Design an enzyme around this catalytic site. Structure first.
Site, PDB file in Angstrom:
ATOM      1  N   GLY A   1      16.415  64.179   9.410  1.00  0.00           N
ATOM      2  CA  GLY A   1      17.292  63.941   8.434  1.00  0.00           C
ATOM      3  C   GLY A   1      16.930  64.387   6.958  1.00  0.00           C
ATOM      4  O   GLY A   1      17.612  63.914   5.924  1.00  0.00           O
TER       5      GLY A   1
ATOM      6  N   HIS B   1      11.418  70.799  -9.273  1.00  0.00           N
ATOM      7  CA  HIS B   1      11.514  69.639  -9.835  1.00  0.00           C
ATOM      8  C   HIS B   1      10.308  68.660 -10.000  1.00  0.00           C
ATOM      9  O   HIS B   1       9.925  67.868 -10.341  1.00  0.00           O
ATOM     10  CB  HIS B   1      12.263  68.477  -8.939  1.00  0.00           C
ATOM     11  CG  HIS B   1      13.775  68.724  -9.109  1.00  0.00           C
ATOM     12  ND1 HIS B   1      14.659  69.452  -8.174  1.00  0.00           N
ATOM     13  CD2 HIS B   1      14.639  68.393  -9.962  1.00  0.00           C
ATOM     14  CE1 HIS B   1      15.915  69.315  -8.186  1.00  0.00           C
ATOM     15  NE2 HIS B   1      15.713  68.633  -9.755  1.00  0.00           N
TER      16      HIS B   1
ATOM     17  N   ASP C   1      18.502  78.546 -15.175  1.00  0.00           N
ATOM     18  CA  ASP C   1      18.549  77.742 -13.753  1.00  0.00           C
ATOM     19  C   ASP C   1      20.087  77.643 -13.620  1.00  0.00           C
ATOM     20  O   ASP C   1      20.963  77.352 -14.418  1.00  0.00           O
ATOM     21  CB  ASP C   1      18.149  76.450 -14.347  1.00  0.00           C
ATOM     22  CG  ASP C   1      18.320  75.621 -12.867  1.00  0.00           C
ATOM     23  OD1 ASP C   1      19.243  75.055 -12.596  1.00  0.00           O
ATOM     24  OD2 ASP C   1      17.329  75.123 -12.289  1.00  0.00           O
TER      25      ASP C   1
ATOM     26  N   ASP D   1      21.129  76.264 -10.691  1.00  0.00           N
ATOM     27  CA  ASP D   1      21.117  75.162  -9.768  1.00  0.00           C
ATOM     28  C   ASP D   1      22.045  73.944 -10.216  1.00  0.00           C
ATOM     29  O   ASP D   1      22.198  73.813 -11.331  1.00  0.00           O
ATOM     30  CB  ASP D   1      19.777  74.404  -9.288  1.00  0.00           C
ATOM     31  CG  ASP D   1      19.677  73.332  -8.346  1.00  0.00           C
ATOM     32  OD1 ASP D   1      20.325  72.524  -8.462  1.00  0.00           O
ATOM     33  OD2 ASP D   1      19.045  73.750  -7.146  1.00  0.00           O
TER      34      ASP D   1
ATOM     35  N   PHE E   1       7.543  73.609 -20.972  1.00  0.00           N
ATOM     36  CA  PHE E   1       7.846  74.246 -21.989  1.00  0.00           C
ATOM     37  C   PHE E   1       8.747  73.602 -22.983  1.00  0.00           C
ATOM     38  O   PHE E   1       9.442  74.301 -23.687  1.00  0.00           O
ATOM     39  CB  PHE E   1       8.362  75.850 -21.646  1.00  0.00           C
ATOM     40  CG  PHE E   1       7.382  76.489 -20.735  1.00  0.00           C
ATOM     41  CD1 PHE E   1       6.217  76.526 -20.772  1.00  0.00           C
ATOM     42  CD2 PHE E   1       8.224  76.911 -19.609  1.00  0.00           C
ATOM     43  CE1 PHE E   1       5.524  77.274 -19.940  1.00  0.00           C
ATOM     44  CE2 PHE E   1       7.430  77.674 -18.454  1.00  0.00           C
ATOM     45  CZ  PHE E   1       6.043  77.913 -18.720  1.00  0.00           C
TER      46      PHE E   1
ATOM     47  N   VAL F   1       9.079  80.225 -24.477  1.00  0.00           N
ATOM     48  CA  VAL F   1      10.014  80.258 -23.235  1.00  0.00           C
ATOM     49  C   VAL F   1      11.309  79.429 -23.725  1.00  0.00           C
ATOM     50  O   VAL F   1      11.354  78.604 -24.511  1.00  0.00           O
ATOM     51  CB  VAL F   1       9.314  79.685 -22.143  1.00  0.00           C
ATOM     52  CG1 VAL F   1      10.455  78.768 -21.376  1.00  0.00           C
ATOM     53  CG2 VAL F   1       8.433  80.751 -21.343  1.00  0.00           C
TER      54      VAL F   1
ATOM     55  N   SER G   1      19.385  75.661 -18.637  1.00  0.00           N
ATOM     56  CA  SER G   1      19.982  75.245 -17.623  1.00  0.00           C
ATOM     57  C   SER G   1      21.442  74.696 -17.501  1.00  0.00           C
ATOM     58  O   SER G   1      22.030  74.119 -18.518  1.00  0.00           O
ATOM     59  CB  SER G   1      19.363  73.906 -17.436  1.00  0.00           C
ATOM     60  OG  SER G   1      19.599  73.208 -16.271  1.00  0.00           O
ATOM     61  N   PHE G   2      22.269  75.349 -16.359  1.00  0.00           N
ATOM     62  CA  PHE G   2      23.537  74.886 -16.216  1.00  0.00           C
ATOM     63  C   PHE G   2      23.595  73.707 -15.105  1.00  0.00           C
ATOM     64  O   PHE G   2      23.070  74.089 -13.827  1.00  0.00           O
ATOM     65  CB  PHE G   2      24.315  76.022 -15.936  1.00  0.00           C
ATOM     66  CG  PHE G   2      24.463  77.112 -16.789  1.00  0.00           C
ATOM     67  CD1 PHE G   2      23.649  77.895 -16.768  1.00  0.00           C
ATOM     68  CD2 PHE G   2      25.559  77.096 -17.817  1.00  0.00           C
ATOM     69  CE1 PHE G   2      23.633  79.085 -17.855  1.00  0.00           C
ATOM     70  CE2 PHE G   2      25.477  78.195 -18.557  1.00  0.00           C
ATOM     71  CZ  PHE G   2      24.664  79.148 -18.611  1.00  0.00           C
TER      72      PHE G   2
ATOM     73  N   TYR H   1      14.734  75.757 -29.076  1.00  0.00           N
ATOM     74  CA  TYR H   1      14.402  76.689 -27.879  1.00  0.00           C
ATOM     75  C   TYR H   1      14.761  76.076 -26.452  1.00  0.00           C
ATOM     76  O   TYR H   1      14.017  76.506 -25.506  1.00  0.00           O
ATOM     77  CB  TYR H   1      13.074  77.208 -27.960  1.00  0.00           C
ATOM     78  CG  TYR H   1      12.892  78.312 -29.214  1.00  0.00           C
ATOM     79  CD1 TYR H   1      13.749  78.415 -30.231  1.00  0.00           C
ATOM     80  CD2 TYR H   1      11.629  78.726 -29.504  1.00  0.00           C
ATOM     81  CE1 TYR H   1      13.805  79.448 -31.058  1.00  0.00           C
ATOM     82  CE2 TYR H   1      11.306  79.658 -30.461  1.00  0.00           C
ATOM     83  CZ  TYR H   1      12.685  80.224 -31.145  1.00  0.00           C
ATOM     84  OH  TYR H   1      12.458  81.142 -32.432  1.00  0.00           O
TER      85      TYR H   1
HETATM   86 CA    CA Z   1      20.251  73.285 -13.530  1.00  0.00          CA
HETATM   87 CA    CA Z   2      10.683  76.233 -24.267  1.00  0.00          CA
END
Ligand code: CA
Ligand code: CA
Ligand code: ZN
Ligand code: ZN
Ligand code: ZN
Ligand code: ZN
EC number: 3.5.1.98
Lengths: 536, 368, 213, 163
Positions: B21, B135, B168, B170, B181, B187, B191-192, B216
């Site tokens: 599971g 993660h 990202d 995901d 970072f 860097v 992220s979306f 940043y």
């Molecule tokens: Ca994401």
């Molecule tokens: Ca950074």
């Protein structure tokens, strides 16, 4: 001076509320306390006056451990950071060592019944059922391959050293646990003595485990064949029904939103909205309509009218002369309103019932329009799909089901009409009706399940429209007013005929005063016609 | 034009079992590779065996105590480590299984080897669908991820590249990668992600960075039911401006496939064509690239998506009909490459999109 | 409800061989006394009950323990301090509770059948009703704001007490280093001060003057 | 009968609302602070023969901070803290390490908790007076001594350890 007093009266008027005016005077008093700078004073004022440019400009002319973000917060300064042995210059100079975030939730949370259909959990369950066989069988096959390779190796040197050959923890493989896992699963509790045995004397242990695993994997493969046959007949009963997330809700929401009281409240809400704005005195002209709708075909109008005729012609409750009245109305006058028989407009002052029926007619037209566009779009995607797939080299650029032919895809639409007509007859149970509709029109078919209810409601509206004297009164007033040329006409001649239009307004008021009056306008542009309706 | 590429597959990565599971189901990579093989894609692409990453490579980011715990933990000795197991977030959410340390070894080794080859300029594109676990934290396992492979890949790449971009896509937020970072200028973490009562519960608009790395770190919260064209209209401009202002030397993409329609734990509604639009968009800028795996729980769709974007990386097109494979019966009843989206309501209304996009643009204008 | 799980697992089976704590009024891992229905947390005992400490068998509460043992038995402040220490020994480890004097202190939705309520109340930024989108009513003022109408717009529902952006306390919440109590007193300084019309208007035309006196 | 309490509101917010914990060995342990009070108050009266009661009540505050701590003084977020204290230095003075802010909670409790012990009138009067002047000295120099700036927070590991 009185400019300030006027500003305060008008801000009271445009704020409509005492408490927010209290907040505003709080802000200005705080600024007077000299704790706020002018730029800051404006950054606190702007939420109040961010949508009235004139007042904002007037006011501007009048004046003349830490934590950041939402989840990141500090580590203790005297905190024993976990030492790392691989820290290079970059590892010290780039890596964070002061800021930490926290995971507010946990994955696999309560999401089973949050937004998922009951027909998707079944597919998820079958997916898990398939995966567990896939993994156990493939581990067994991998172990078989690995021990086959070691046996093929072992059968190749002299026998005097074969007893010297040994096997390590990996069972000769690349993974330390995969083979051992497989043997444990195969053998239950007696596995580890055999593991010791094939590690100690592989030459006499490899063939026997190989034979037992061979028999077990053939048994599991046959069981897999049976299980996979059973697994089918299940994706077919759920895939298309899983892709549709609105039908179950949509049935009730449309059957509830088409009641007359809902249709009334939808425009009363707009009326009160514009009334509140007018009380505010905001910059908005007092001629902008309330609701705008659009028809972008005439053939679709003929189709809808044909459908309504098809229903009403097979009713017992309305007599033949009323059938003639209904035919005359729908197939002559409603086209007359739309000017089916630029910058040309037609006006019509209507009672409650006329608003109801004619909004329902717009909804029916819009539904059919979405259906038409989806059918044409399917045809185009399928044609371009053949075009793209025919010329394709696949890897050189360095059972199943039969899709319908283009003829059937083009025949989809009239077939759908026959189907909805049949549903109106009721000889076709709605269950396989909706199954067929979905199987043709995929995820866009969600809109057309409740067409029968809409058609019968429109028919009741028509029966009442003929029966009630107020409607007939309204229509012949429209007729003589069009005869005068007052009702509707050229956009340029609007200033010429405003007077007679206003007299028509007066007549409408005196005729239907104890009921809500509506204005309806039909302006034609580039082949499409735009509904505009407003209350009075 | 066509350019050389590398793929790292270890045939055992699919054999590990997370538990009954457990939506983390490592079989997905094996069907992805089989589908690639029966599409005849291996003739134009090189497939390699990843070396298992040494614990010394893992301690370059993670705490040595964490790695000792990971290597010493087994299902049979749950009793003898319960205090550390509670201390290290290993349990119901992230469970102990057979050969977990081997799985983490392989996952990080693939991407670190890709980064070593990328730094050497021997290729401009490498693929590792086993990795991308984002993660995982400095000293804890969260979100089905144990050893944060992406951070090690980026640390390897920085040895020769001045600026690098992490993207990202995901449905979850790359919390570990950004936290690593959070305070550096070398860097950016774009992220979306869906926000709101969703794991991990971080990733607001204003989590915009800190210290020298202030401005940043850009995040994009979204609502349920994002669709294809909405994602397309929001991705291309943001990416074009980010890599116009930053001008990076390398790019890393986490193709989290849990953003697809009909996922077990996702709410988005993207299609495979919409998902590969992103990889075409980023590649068109012609910079050395690393593609990693991650989420994706509706296993058939995960296979479809990864296979398609791989084929896009080769600049190769494949018939919409799926060729025969050992797991053919998973793609019933249509057995087609591309998937049709669901029809749930999109809560990401256009003015919300416009406002969030504008705020991001203003925030990016501050970069020197 | 034909599940395939049982049969498949039996087919792959290896052969083998033949509601709330009474102390803190909160849930979690609880041990219930076998003489009284009261239950206590593993850290709600004197001393705390660790995992390895629990005895094999029935469990008894501290209050039941005191009752059972009582049945079986059947200007120097040194004496007050001994009384206090005995009382503290007798006490149960429930919690520390703040005094109530300090810790203490619908219409904008579709109808049950689904309908816009009348009369309507509108979003402050657009003067549009609930029909277009759900309306969020401020808990401090009766202002309703949309989801996408703020700056920046919210993504998800504010589960707690939302703070409307028209109110001034935002300038007080800007600081990230000051204590809560100062912020609370600053908030309450504006939560009672009302009806000051003349003084604020006078101050406004006072500051309005271009030439300071 | 307590004065300048709003510091308790801050303590409550940082401990169980902001999820920001206190330093285990911060400074000025409670027994040390009590000794400092004893030293400071000895230089107030010209002839305080009543030092025999001053020291006794200070030591009484010590002994009441000895056993009462942990039972009904800490918050649900503070169970792991008390557990770590009891498991790491049990033979060490348990009436130590914990800083001043926990002291005021003891007096906040005792003002209602005394209502179950029937002392005599003069003794309770003296105890009331000593609570009063102890707290007024605390209110006098609270800013110097009480400091919420150095309040570290709990990573998710401590969150799991707590609940
Ligand atoms: Ca994401
Ligand atoms: Ca950074
Ligand atoms: Zn409890
Ligand atoms: Zn009991
Ligand atoms: Zn609004
Ligand atoms: Zn408010």
């Amino acid at each position: 001076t009185l400019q300030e007093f006027s500003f305060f009266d008008k801000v009271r008027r445009v704020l409509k509320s005492q408490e927010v005016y209290e907040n505003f005077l709080r802000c200005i008093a705080l600024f007077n306390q000299e704790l706020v700078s002018g730029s800051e004073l404006l950054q606190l004022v702007s939420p109040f006056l961010g949508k009235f440019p004139e007042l904002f400009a007037q006011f501007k002319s009048f004046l003349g451990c830490k934590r950041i973000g939402s989840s990141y917060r500090a580590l203790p300064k005297t905190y024993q950071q976990p030492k790392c042995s691989g820290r290079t210059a970059i590892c010290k100079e780039v890596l964070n060592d002061t800021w930490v975030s926290f995971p507010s939730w946990s994955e696999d949370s309560t999401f089973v019944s949050s937004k998922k259909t009951p027909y998707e959990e079944q597919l998820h369950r079958c997916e898990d059922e398939r995966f567990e066989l896939d993994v156990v069988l493939e581990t067994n096959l991998a172990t078989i391959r690995v021990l086959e390779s070691v046996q093929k190796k072992l059968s190749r040197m002299a026998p005097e050293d074969q007893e010297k050959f040994r096997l390590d923890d990996s069972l000769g493989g690349t993974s330390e646990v995969i083979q051992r896992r497989a043997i444990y699963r195969i053998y239950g509790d007696k596995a580890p003595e055999i593991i010791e045995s094939l590690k100690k004397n592989p030459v006499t242990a490899v063939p026997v485990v190989l034979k037992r695993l061979k028999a077990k994997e053939e048994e599991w493969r046959e069981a897999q064949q049976g299980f996979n046959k059973i697994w089918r007949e299940q994706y077919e009963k759920a895939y298309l029904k899983s892709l549709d997330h609105q039908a179950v809700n949509f049935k009730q929401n449309d059957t509830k939103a088409l009641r007359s009281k809902s249709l009334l409240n939808e425009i009363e809400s707009v009326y009160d909205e514009h009334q509140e704005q007018h009380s505010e005195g905001r910059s908005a002209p007092s001629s902008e309509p309330h609701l705008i709708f659009v028809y972008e075909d005439r053939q679709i109008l003929e189709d809808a009218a044909a459908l309504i005729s098809y229903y009403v012609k097979r009713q017992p409750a309305i007599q033949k002369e009323d059938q003639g009245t209904i035919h005359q109305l729908l197939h002559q006058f409603v086209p007359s309103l739309f000017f089916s028989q630029d910058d040309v407009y037609s006006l019509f002052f209507a009672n409650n019932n006329w608003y109801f029926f004619l909004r329902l007619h717009q909804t029916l037209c819009s539904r059919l329009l979405k259906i038409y566009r989806q059918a044409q779009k399917q045809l185009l995607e399928y044609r371009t799909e053949k075009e793209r797939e025919k010329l394709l080299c696949e890897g050189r650029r360095e059972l199943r089901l039969k899709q319908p032919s283009e003829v059937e895809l083009e025949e989809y639409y009239p077939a759908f009409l026959d189907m909805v007509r049949s549903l109106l007859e009721g000889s076709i149970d709605p269950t396989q009706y909706e199954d067929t509709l979905r199987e043709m029109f995929t995820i866009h078919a969600y809109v057309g399940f409740t067409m029968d209810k809409l058609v019968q409601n429109i028919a009741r509206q028509l029966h009442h429209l003929v029966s009630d004297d107020v409607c007939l009164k309204v229509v012949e007033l429209y007729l003589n007013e069009k005869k005068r040329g007052a009702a509707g006409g050229n956009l340029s001649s609007r200033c010429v005929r405003a007077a007679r239009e206003t007299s028509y307004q007066w007549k409408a008021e005196r005729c239907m005063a104890d009921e809500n009056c509506f204005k309806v306008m039909f302006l034609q542009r580039k082949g499409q016609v735009i509904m505009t309706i407003e209350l009075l | 034009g066509k350019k050389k590429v590398c793929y790292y597959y270890d045939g055992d990565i699919g054999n590990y079992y997370y538990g009954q599971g457990h939506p983390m189901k490592p079989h997905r990579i094996r069907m992805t590779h089989n589908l690639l093989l029966n599409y005849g894609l291996y003739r134009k692409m090189e497939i390699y065996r990843p070396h298992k990453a040494t614990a010394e490579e893992m301690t370059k980011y993670h705490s040595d105590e964490y790695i000792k715990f990971l290597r010493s933990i087994r299902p049979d000795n749950m009793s003898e480590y319960s205090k550390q197991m509670q201390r290290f977030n290993v349990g119901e959410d992230c469970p102990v299984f057979d050969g977990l340390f081997e799985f983490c070894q392989l996952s990080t080794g693939g991407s670190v080897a890709g980064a070593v080859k990328l730094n050497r300029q021997q290729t401009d594109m490498a693929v590792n669908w086993a990795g991308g676990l984002h993660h995982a934290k400095k000293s804890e396992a969260s979100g089905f991820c144990y050893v944060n492979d992406i951070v090690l890949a980026i640390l390897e790449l920085l040895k020769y590249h001045q600026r690098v971009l992490y993207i990202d896509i995901d449905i979850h937020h790359g919390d570990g990668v950004e936290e690593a970072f959070y305070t550096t200028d070398r860097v950016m973490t774009v992220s979306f992600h869906k926000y709101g009562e969703y794991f991990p519960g971080t990733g607001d608009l204003r989590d915009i960075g800190a210290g020298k790395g202030k401005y940043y770190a850009v995040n994009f919260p979204m609502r349920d039911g994002i669709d294809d064209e909405s994602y397309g209209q929001i991705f291309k401009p943001i990416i074009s401006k980010v890599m116009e202002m930053y001008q990076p030397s390398a790019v890393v993409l986490q193709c989290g496939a849990d953003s697809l329609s009909g996922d077990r734990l996702g709410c988005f509604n993207l299609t495979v064509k919409g998902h590969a639009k992103c990889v075409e968009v980023v590649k068109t800028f012609n910079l050395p690239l690393l593609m990693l795996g991650g989420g994706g729980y509706t296993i058939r769709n995960v296979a479809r998506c990864w296979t398609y974007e791989t084929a896009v990386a080769l600049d190769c097109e494949i018939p919409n009909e799926l060729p025969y494979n050992d797991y053919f019966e998973y793609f019933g009843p249509d057995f087609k490459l591309h998937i049709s989206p669901s029809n749930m309501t999109n809560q990401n209304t256009p003015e919300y999109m416009e406002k969030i996009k504008q705020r991001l643009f203003e925030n990016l204008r501050m970069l020197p | 409800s034909g599940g395939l799980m049982e049969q498949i697992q039996a087919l792959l089976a290896p052969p083998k061989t033949d509601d709330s704590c009474d102390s803190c009024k909160e849930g979690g891992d609880l041990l219930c006394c076998d003489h009284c229905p009261a239950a206590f947390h593993l850290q709600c005992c004197n001393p705390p009950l660790s995992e390895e400490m629990l005895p094999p068998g029935e469990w008894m509460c501290h209050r039941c323990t005191v009752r059972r043992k009582k049945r079986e038995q059947k200007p120097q402040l040194r004496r007050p301090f001994e009384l206090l220490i005995a009382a503290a020994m007798e006490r149960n480890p429930t919690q520390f509770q703040l005094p109530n004097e300090l810790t203490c202190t619908t219409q904008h939705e579709l109808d049950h059948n689904g309908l816009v309520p009348l009369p309507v109340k509108v979003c402050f930024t657009c003067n549009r009703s609930c029909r277009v989108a759900p309306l969020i009513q401020c808990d401090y003022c009766p202002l309703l704001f949309h989801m996408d109408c703020l700056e920046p717009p919210l993504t998800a529902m504010p589960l707690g007490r939302w703070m409307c952006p028209n109110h001034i306390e935002h300038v007080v919440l800007n600081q990230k280093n000051m204590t809560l109590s100062n912020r609370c007193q600053v908030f309450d300084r504006f939560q009672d001060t009302v009806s000051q019309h003349v003084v604020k208007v006078d101050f406004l035309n006072r500051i309005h003057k271009k030439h300071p006196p | 009968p307590e004065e300048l309490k709003p510091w308790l509101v801050d303590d409550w917010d940082l401990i169980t609302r902001q999820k920001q914990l206190f330093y285990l060995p911060a400074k000025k342990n409670v027994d040390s602070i009590l000794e400092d009070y004893a030293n400071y108050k000895k230089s107030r009266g010209n002839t305080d023969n009543k030092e025999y009661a001053v020291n006794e009540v200070v030591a009484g505050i010590k002994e009441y901070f000895n056993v009462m701590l942990g039972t009904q003084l800490l918050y649900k977020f503070e169970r792991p803290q008390y557990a770590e204290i009891l498991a790491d230095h049990p033979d060490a003075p348990m009436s130590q390490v914990y800083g001043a802010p926990h002291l005021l909670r003891l007096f906040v409790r005792i003002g209602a908790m005394l209502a179950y012990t029937p002392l005599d009138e003069k003794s309770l009067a003296l105890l009331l007076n000593y609570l009063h002047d102890f707290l007024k000295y605390l209110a006098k120099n609270s800013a110097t001594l009480f400091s919420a700036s150095d309040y570290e927070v709990a990573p998710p590991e401590y969150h799991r350890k707590a609940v």
